[PDB]
Amino acid sequence: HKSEVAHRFKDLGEENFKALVLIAFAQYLQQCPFEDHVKLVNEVTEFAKTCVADESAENCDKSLHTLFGDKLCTVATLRETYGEMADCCAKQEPERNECFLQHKDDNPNLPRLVRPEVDVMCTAFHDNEETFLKKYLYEIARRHPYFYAPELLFFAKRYKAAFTECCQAADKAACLLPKLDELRDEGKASSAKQRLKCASLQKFGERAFKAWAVARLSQRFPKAEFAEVSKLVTDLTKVHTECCHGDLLECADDRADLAKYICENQDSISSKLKECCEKPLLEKSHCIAEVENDEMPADLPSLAADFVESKDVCKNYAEAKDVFLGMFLYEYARRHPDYSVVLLLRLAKTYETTLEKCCAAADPHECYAKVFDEFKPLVEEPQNLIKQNCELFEQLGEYKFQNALLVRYTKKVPQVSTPTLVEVSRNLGKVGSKCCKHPEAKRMPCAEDYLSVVLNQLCVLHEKTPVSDRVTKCCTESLVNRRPCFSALEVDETYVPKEFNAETFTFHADICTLSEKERQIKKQTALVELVKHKPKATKEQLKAVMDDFAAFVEKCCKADDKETCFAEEGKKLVAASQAALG
Ligand SMILES: CCCCCCCCCCCCCC(=O)O
Ligand SMILES: CCCCCCCCCCCCCC(=O)O
Ligand SMILES: CCCCCCCCCCCCCC(=O)O
Ligand SMILES: [Ru+3]
Ligand SMILES: [Ru+3]
């Protein structure tokens, strides 16, 4: 186009343009106040209207990176608050924009965004609605810089739907709090999911990411031919390559072009895209990525007719090992939408290792005749782990299930810090809360997706604090081996039990008057130090104690005398559990 700003101002809208421009300058100017960005956003949008009224006005034909970088150097505090980033303004445009992406700080040093009371949020949301959503959007963007700016706009529109519906209701906290926590746990999961694909691209190479894209696209698009899925995997690998680079316009255009090809080839990809392709350009890439798995033709035959019993299997493989193996991922994923994508890569590696061993023998057909028999143990292993834990989640509650995990995983790796073991077991319990509530045809894709972000969060906290060698080995291993590595952990026999500290196992009358979240944290934090003090404690002993602690809380909180009860009964509970866990 003759003017980049005029075009993007048209096919996005003025309300969407000012929002993205705010997120743009918030991720680069993470130290300027909110009033400065509003000054810049209003100066940019007023300039954008000049190019809409005339495509040949002052500096309208310039590039967006030039207009973005020109505004980036207008700030006077650029030399003081960022300093080194101000040096980028002395380079040419193809390097200046590259200079700005490097000096972007991933993890700044800002306070946490404290969630205030519902009354003060519904008053600010009602008094001045626009600046309320923009300020908090400016606070999320300045703390998550590499977050995809358009996708961050999709969450802000969801928050707006939570206030308009709940801030005029009965107990607004009953309407809003289960929604803000939903949007937080989902928003933090999206921030960690896209950050994981960048690590998996530079650690496992370009080939490993393509195998993952082959298995998920063919799973999502079973009616698509292998040539069409292979074409999409190449474009998909290019998108996440340049989106992880840090550039917004470079990543926004690649995703927009990919969505246009998918919408122009719905007859050879999927039939579920009618609704997604109706949406405008901003929502195309987001809708398509979350489209439901299409139905398989159901008339598909077995895989032994082309990969086992057929002739020239070693010939079709040796001619192109990556093309032949990718078909095995294609032909197996679209016939198993219930398998996790990581599980399908585990089967293809089994098929890959078998062909490299059988085709080097005298009689190949007799060798790999049992290649499909090796898949059943690898497939039953995650299915049985889903069955064991979901049945445990059916008996116990969600809270009682978290404690079962908190005891099981503390005895395996007792060296991990207590606050880490708590947040892990509670986030891990949230996985079974919604994945076990799905049928068996969706349990493994659910568990794979949430375990991927929870296990990676564990490895992030363990990377900045080396604690256990067994945890480091599982965090360093491959993608198909990461989750089985954690499931293969056993009880640490070399662990010396931690010395007793009475201050930890002392409880005061404040737990009678804490929120349900704070109460569950303290009951579980004390359960970790209880196991770390006596790791060889059997479960029947822990059925007690925890029941003696249940009566200890009901005896002190309900009595007319508090604080004093925690001193008398607190000594009885501790000392009785001393001889109970002998
Ligand atoms: C002057 C700052 C400009 C910041 C970027 C404004 C235009 C963003 C366009 C985003 C298009 C998204 C396409 C897509 O993901 O489907
Ligand atoms: C042109 C399409 C190429 C698709 C290549 C897929 C190859 C998958 C082989 C199995 C990979 C298992 C993971 C690994 O070996 O690290
Ligand atoms: C030897 C120290 C004894 C006192 C500490 C015991 C800690 C028990 C924690 C119980 C947590 C679960 C409570 C519940 O079921 O709601
Ligand atoms: Ru965050
Ligand atoms: Ru993606």
Ligand 3 surroundings by CB, under 6 angstroms: 403, 505, 523, 526-527, 530, 545-546, 549-550, 573-574, 577
Q: 3-state class of 293 per DSSP?
A: coil
Please give the full DSSP string across 117-135, using - where no structure is assigned: -HHHHHHHHHHSHHHHHHH
Nearest residue to 537 via CA among 430, 381, 408, 365: 408
Q: Give the resolution value in Å.
A: 3.2
Q: 3-state class of 321 per DSSP?
A: helix
Residue type, 32: C
Residue type, 521: I
Q: H or E segment at 136?
A: helix 129-143
What's the CA gap between 339 and 444, in Å, rounded?
A: 6
Report whether 216 contacts 197 (CB < 8 A).
no
Q: From the options 1.20.58.1610, 3.30.70.20, 1.10.246.10, 3.40.50.970, give the CATH code of 295-380.
A: 1.10.246.10
CA angle 341, 344, 346 (to 5 degrees): 115
HSE on the CB side for 176, CA within 13 Å?
24
Q: State both tokens at 256.
A: 């927009």
Q: State both tokens at 417.
A: 């810090």
312: alpha, beta or left? (left if phi > 0; alpha if psi -120 to 50): left
Report whether 422 contacts 520 (CB < 8 A).
no
Report whether 239 contacts 255 (CB < 8 A).
yes
Please give the full DSSP string across 93-107, using - where no structure is assigned: HHHHHHHHHHT--SS
Query: Distance between alpha carbon 426 and the CA centroid of its chain, in Å?
Result: 16
User: Ligand 5 centre and the CA of 289: distance in Å?
Assistant: 7
CATH number of 381-492: 1.10.246.10
Cβ neighbours of residue 256 closer than 8 Å, sequence gap 6 or more: 281, 284, 285
Query: Distance between alpha carbon 274 and the CA centroid of its chain, in Å?
Result: 27
Proximal ligand: closest to the CA of 230: 2
Q: From the options 3.40.50.1000, 3.90.1150.10, 1.10.246.10, 3.40.50.720, give the CATH code of 1-105.
A: 1.10.246.10
User: Ligand 4 centre and the CA of 192: distance in Å?
Assistant: 9
The residue to mutate among 545, 552, 581, having the most atoms of ligand 3 within 8 angstroms of its beta carbon, is: 545
What's the CA gap between 40 and 46, in Å, rounded?
A: 10
Residue type, 185: D
CATH T-level fold of 106-195 = Serum Albumin; Chain A, Domain 1 (1.10.246)
What's the CA gap between 480 and 184, in Å, rounded?
A: 28
Let me know how long the chain is. 582
Report whether 364 contacts 314 (CB < 8 A).
yes
Q: Which residues are annotated as a binding site for (4Z,15Z)-bilirubin IXalpha?
A: 238
CATH number of 493-570: 1.10.246.10
Packing angle, helices 281-289 and 248-264, rounded to 10 = 70
**Deposited experimental method:** X-ray
Q: Where are the domains of the chain?
A: 1-105, 106-195, 203-294, 295-380, 381-492, 493-570
User: Ligand 3 centre and the CA of 272: distance in Å?
Assistant: 50
Proximal ligand: closest to the CA of 232: 2
Cβ neighbours of residue 377 closer than 8 Å, sequence gap 6 or more: none
Please give the full DSSP string across 166-189, using - where no structure is assigned: HSSSSSHHHHHHHHHHHHHHHHHH
What's the CA gap between 371 and 378, in Å, rounded?
A: 12
Proximal ligand: closest to the CA of 147: 4
State the DSSP code for 57. S
Where does 359-504 have alpha helices with state H?
364-367, 375-395, 398-412, 418-435, 440-463, 469-476, 479-487
The CATH-assigned architecture of domain 203-294 is Orthogonal Bundle (1.10)
No. of H helices and E strands in the chain?
Answer: 28, 0
What's the CA gap between 44 and 39, in Å, rounded?
A: 9
Residue entry with tokens 């960690």? 192
Q: H or E segment at 319?
A: helix 313-319
Nearest residue to 146 via CA among 196, 210, 204, 215: 196
Residue type, 337: P
Report whether 224 contacts 218 (CB < 8 A).
yes
State the DSSP code for 81. I
HSE on the CB side for 323, CA within 13 Å?
10
Q: State both tokens at 364.
A: 């190949």
Please give the full DSSP string across 57-114, using - where no structure is assigned: STT-SS-HHHHHHHHHT--TTIIIIIGGGGGGGGS-HHHHHHHHHHT--SS--PPP--
What's the CA gap between 488 and 404, in Å, rounded?
A: 17
What's the CA gap between 483 and 468, in Å, rounded?
A: 17
Report whether 141 contacts 22 (CB < 8 A).
yes
Buried/exposed code over 7-29 (b: 16+ C-beta within 10 A; e: otherwise): ebbeebeeebbbbbbbbbbbbbb
Buried/exposed code over 408-425 (b: 16+ C-beta within 10 A; e: otherwise): ebbbbbbebebebbbebb
Q: First vs last Cα of the chain: how many Å apart?
A: 79
